[PDB]
C-alpha cells in the first residue's frame, strides 16, 4: 500500500509508524470542597451601572458551569476563546465576574474589540479576551413605569477607556475651548447619562443584565470544574489530565525536586516535562511513550513473500528476535 504497487522490489521500506497506545486514563483535579457562588453575582437584587461595572473574584471554590450553560433563561451566551460545552472540564487559575446593566441594542457592544459608546467609554474587552458574556433581558426588574433612572452610563469620555478599565469620574466634560472648573453649562456637560428604563420601550431600549466571566488560563488552579479525581498510575502509558493540563504519557516518579512555588516544569522542548499532582505535592516526570518507525525489510516479491520487520530506536520489549543498534 505504501509503494502503491503490487510488486515490491528488494529493499527496506519505511512502511508505517508504531505508536504505543495508552490503555488507562487518569483525571486528577484539585481536591477542593466548595461551590463557587454564581448565584450571588447572577441572582442579585440590583446591578451596578455600566460606567461603574461591579467585579467579583471567584476563587478557592469548585465551579460548575453546566448549570449556567443548561439554563435557558440567559438570552445570549457567547463565549470567546472557550467552548461553553467544554467549560465543565477546564480549570482556571483566576476567574473574574463583571456585572452591569445596558440596553438590548448595546448587548453587541460587549464583545472583544467592539466599538461604540459602551465599548469605548464604559466597558472594553481586550482583543485576546478569553471568557464568556451572558446577557439576559431584565425588563421585569430594571424597568419601572415612568422610567427607571437608577442605571447610568458614561457618554462623553475625554480619554477612551482601556480594556478592563472602570471610569467612575464625574468631572464635567469640557467640549469647548474655555474650561469648566466643575461648572456645568454649554460645552460643559455631566459625563454620565441615565437610562430611563420604561416597560413600554422597545427591546432595543429594554434593560439587560450582563455578566462577563473572564478566565485566566496558565499556576495553581483556584477554580476547577466538577470532576471525579481518580487514582494515579506510575509506570504506565496512560492519558492524564493534571489540573486541566491534558496529555498522554508515562507518569513516573522523578528524583528532581521542584522549587516550593514551582508547579509545571518544561525543558527546552517546552513540553510539560514534569507536573505536580494536586492531591499530593509529588513531582511526576513525563516521558513520551515509545514511538518508532516500522520499516518492512522485504526481499523481492519475485523471490519470496517472507518479510522481516524493523522497529526503529526501540527495545525489543514494547513490540526469533535480534536486538541491534
Amino acid at each position, epitope marked *: 500500500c505504501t509503494l502503491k504497487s503490487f510488486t515490491v522490489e528488494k529493499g527496506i521500506y519505511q512502511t508505517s509508524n508504531f505508536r504505543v497506545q495508552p490503555t488507562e486514563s487518569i483525571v486528577r483535579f484539585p481536591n477542593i470542597t466548595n461551590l463557587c457562588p454564581f448565584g450571588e453575582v447572577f441572582n*442579585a437584587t440590583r446591578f451596578a451601572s455600566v460606567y461603574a461595572w461591579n467585579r467579583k473574584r471567584i476563587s478557592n471554590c469548585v465551579a460548575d458551569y453546566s448549570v449556567l450553560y443548561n439554563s435557558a*433563561s440567559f438570552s445570549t451566551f457567547k463565549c470567546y476563546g472557550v467552548s461553553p460545552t467544554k467549560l465543565n472540564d477546564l480549570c482556571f487559575t483566576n476567574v473574574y465576574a463583571d456585572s452591569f446593566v445596558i440596553r438590548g441594542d448595546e448587548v453587541r457592544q460587549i464583545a472583544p474589540g467592539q466599538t461604540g459608546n459602551i465599548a469605548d467609554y464604559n466597558y472594553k474587552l481586550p482583543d485576546d479576551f478569553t471568557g464568556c458574556v451572558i446577557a439576559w433581558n431584565s425588563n*421585569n426588574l430594571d424597568s419601572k*413605569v*415612568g422610567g427607571n433612572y437608577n442605571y447610568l452610563y458614561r457618554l462623553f469620555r475625554k480619554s477612551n477607556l482601556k480594556p478592563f478599565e472602570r471610569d467612575i469620574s464625574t468631572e464635567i466634560y469640557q467640549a469647548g475651548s474655555t474650561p469648566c472648573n466643575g461648572v456645568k453649562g454649554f460645552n460643559c456637560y455631566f459625563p454620565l447619562q441615565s437610562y430611563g428604563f420604561q416597560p413600554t420601550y422597545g427591546v432595543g431600549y429594554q434593560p439587560y443584565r450582563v455578566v462577563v466571566l473572564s478566565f485566566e488560563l496558565l499556576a495553581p488552579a483556584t477554580v476547577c470544574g466538577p470532576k471525579k479525581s481518580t487514582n494515579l498510575v506510575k509506570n504506565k502509558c496512560v492519558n492524564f489530565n493534571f489540573n486541566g493540563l491534558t496529555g498522554t504519557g508515562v507518569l513516573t516518579e522523578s528524583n528532581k525536586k521542584f522549587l516550593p512555588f514551582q508547579q509545571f516544569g518544561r525543558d527546552i522542548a517546552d513540553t510539560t516535562d514534569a507536573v505536580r499532582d494536586p492531591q499530593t505535592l509529588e513531582i511526576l516526570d513525563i516521558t513520551p511513550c515509545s514511538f518508532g518507525g516500522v520499516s518492512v525489510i522485504t526481499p523481492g516479491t519475485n523471490t519470496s513473500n517472507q518479510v522481516a520487520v524493523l522497529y526503529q530506536g526501540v527495545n525489543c520489549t514494547e513490540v526469533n528476535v535480534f536486538q541491534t543498534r
Partner: antibody
Amino acid sequence: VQLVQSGAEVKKPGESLRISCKGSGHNSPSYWISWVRQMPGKGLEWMGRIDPSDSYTNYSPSFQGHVTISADKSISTAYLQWSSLQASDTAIYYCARHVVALTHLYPDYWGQGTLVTVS
Amino acid sequence: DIQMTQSPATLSVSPGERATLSCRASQSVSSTLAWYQQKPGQAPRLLIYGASTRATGIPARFSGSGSGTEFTLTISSLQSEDFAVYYCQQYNNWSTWTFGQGTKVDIKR
C-alpha cells in the same frame, strides 16, 4: 426557606422597641426582606424592605420617619425598630421575603407575625 | 405611589361556583402583581404571582389573569376552606410596594 420572628411585645407609649426576624435558606445573599403591618381590623400595608447584603432600605412614604429597618447578614436577621412607640403602633407585624429569580422576583415565605401592644 | 383598589368589597358565593375578584392600579404595573389569601387568624398565603403564575402547592382551581392596570383572580369550584380576604400587591423592583384593601369571600344565602 424559613423565617422566624420574635415573640409578642407589650410596651408603654414612648418606649423604644425592636422586633427581629431571622431568615434562612435564601437563594443568594442579595434578597428582599420586607415588613408589613396589620392593625386588628385593618388590611395589609407595606412598610419597607432591605437587602441585607447591601443593607439598602426603601422605606414607605407613610412610614419613612416613623420606624427604622436594619439587618445583620452574619446572622441573616432583620430588625424593625421604633424609637418612640404610640398607641397607634399596636398591630401585628409580619416579615416576608422576596428572592430574585434572574428573570423576575419571587416571594417564597411569609412570617408568622409578631403582635405589638402599645399601652 | 401606585394605588391598588379591589372589587367587590365583599361577595357571597356558594360552593362549586366561580368567584371573581378584580384589582386595579393607578398607572401600569406591567405584570408584577401577586394575590394573597389571609384566613382568619392565619398569616397571608401567596396564591398567584406575576399576575398569571400559580404558586406551587396551591390548588389548581385558583387562576390569575390581566395586565397593565387591571387584573383578575378567579376561583373556580369554590370550596369550604376558601373563605378568606384576598389582596393584590405589586412589587415593582425600584418602587414602593403598594397594597389593596382586600375583598372578603363568604357563603351565598
